C-alpha cells in the first residue's frame, strides 16, 4: 500500500524561563524513528526504531548538524514573527514546521509538503505543485515574497521528489520486517444495557497497524450515523493502534445492525453482528 515520511518540528519561546525549546520527530507511516530534544542529554538526533540503527556515524552527525541548524533558524524566526505581529517580548509563542513526502503502492512519488505555523494557526505553506506558496495573512506575504526571490520552492522540490522518496524507500527496505507489516485488527462486539428500552453495541478494533482504519455501522444494510459514537484512533504503546465505534439501538433490534471494518491488513471488508 501507500507510504509516507514526515518530520514535525516545534519551537516554543518562554520569556524569562530561558531561551526557546525545540523538538523534532520523524515518522515513516505511523512509526516514529528519530527524535531531537534541544534540552536533552545527548544533543544529537536519536534513534527511536531498531532499523534506523543500521545508519552509521556520518548519518547521525549529519542529521544532528541539520536539526541544530533548523532549531537556530526557528530562534531567529520567533523574534522576527514578534516584530511582524507587533507583539510584546512578554508572551510565550510557538513555531511549528512539517515537511515530508508520500509515495504510492509502487513506491513512486505521490506528493510533497512543507508547511509552517505560528501560534496554532497557518502562516505559510508550499502548494501541491511545489512551485508556489500560500500565505495565510498579510504578515506572511512578506515571507512569501522573500522565499519566492530566494527560489526556496525549487530547493524544497528537489528534496521532496528526490532525497525524501529515496530515503523513505531505503527505510522501508531496511525496516521491512516491521514497516511493511500489516496487522489486521483483532475485532469483537460488546453489548451493554442500563434500561429495558435501549442497548449500546460497541464494535472494537485492536492491535492493528498501520493506523488507518474505517469503522462504520449499518442498519438493515443502510449506513447508520445517527445515535453513533466513533472515538479517535489511539496508540496502544506497543506500535499498534485501537479504535471503537458504538451505536445505541432499541431493545430487540440488535440483529438489524452490523459493524463494518476496513483495514489494509484485511483481505476483505469484515462485517460484525451482535453475538
Amino acid at each position: 500500500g501507500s507510504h509516507s515520511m514526515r518530520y514535525f518540528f516545534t519551537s516554543v519561546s518562554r520569556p524569562g524561563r530561558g531561551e526557546p525549546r525545540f523538538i523534532a520527530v520523524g515518522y515513516v507511516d505511523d512509526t516514529q524513528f528519530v527524535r531531537f530534544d534541544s534540552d536533552a542529554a545527548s544533543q544529537r538526533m536519536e534513534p527511536r526504531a531498531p532499523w534506523i540503527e543500521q545508519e552509521g556515524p556520518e548519518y547521525w552527525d549529519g542529521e544532528t548538524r541539520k536539526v541544530k541548524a533548523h532549531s537556530q533558524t526557528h530562534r531567529v524566526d520567533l523574534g522576527t514573527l514578534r516584530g511582524y505581529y507587533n507583539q510584546s517580548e512578554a508572551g510565550s509563542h510557538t513555531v511549528q514546521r512539517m515537511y515530508g513526502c508520500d509515495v504510492g503502492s509502487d513506491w513512486r512519488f505521490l506528493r510533497g509538503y512543507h508547511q509552517y505555523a505560528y501560534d496554532g494557526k497557518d502562516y505559510i505553506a508550499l502548494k501541491e505543485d511545489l512551485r508556489s506558496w500560500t500565505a495565510a495573512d498579510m504578515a506572511a506575504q512578506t515571507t512569501k515574497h522573500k522565499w519566492e526571490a530566494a527560489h526556496v520552492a525549487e530547493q524544497l522540490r528537489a528534496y521532496l521528489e528526490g532525497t525524501c522518496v529515496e530515503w523513505l524507500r531505503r527505510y522501508l527496505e531496511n525496516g521491512k520486517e516491521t514497516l511493511q507489516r500489516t496487522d489486521a485488527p483483532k475485532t469483537h462486539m460488546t453489548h451493554h444495557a442500563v434500561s429495558d428500552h435501549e442497548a449500546t453495541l460497541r464494535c472494537w478494533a485492536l492491535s492493528f497497524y498501520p493506523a488507518e482504519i474505517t469503522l462504520t455501522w449499518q442498519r438493515d444494510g443502510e449506513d447508520q450515523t445517527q445515535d453513533t459514537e466513533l472515538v479517535e484512533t489511539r496508540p496502544a504503546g506497543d506500535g499498534t493502534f485501537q479504535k471503537w465505534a458504538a451505536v445505541v439501538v432499541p431493545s430487540g433490534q440488535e440483529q438489524r445492525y452490523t459493524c463494518h471494518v476496513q483495514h489494509e491488513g484485511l483481505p476483505k471488508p469484515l462485517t460484525l453482528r451482535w453475538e
Binding site: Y7, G26, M45, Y59, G62, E63, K66, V67, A69, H70, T73, V76, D77, T80, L81, Y84, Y99, Y116, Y123, I124, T143, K146, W147, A150, V152, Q155, L156, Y159, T163, C164, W167
Partner: peptide, 10 residues
C-alpha cells in the same frame, strides 16, 4: 532523512 537546507528565515 532530513532536508539539507539552507533553512531560509521567515
Amino acid at each position: 532523512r532530513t532536508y539539507s537546507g539552507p533553512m531560509n528565515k521567515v
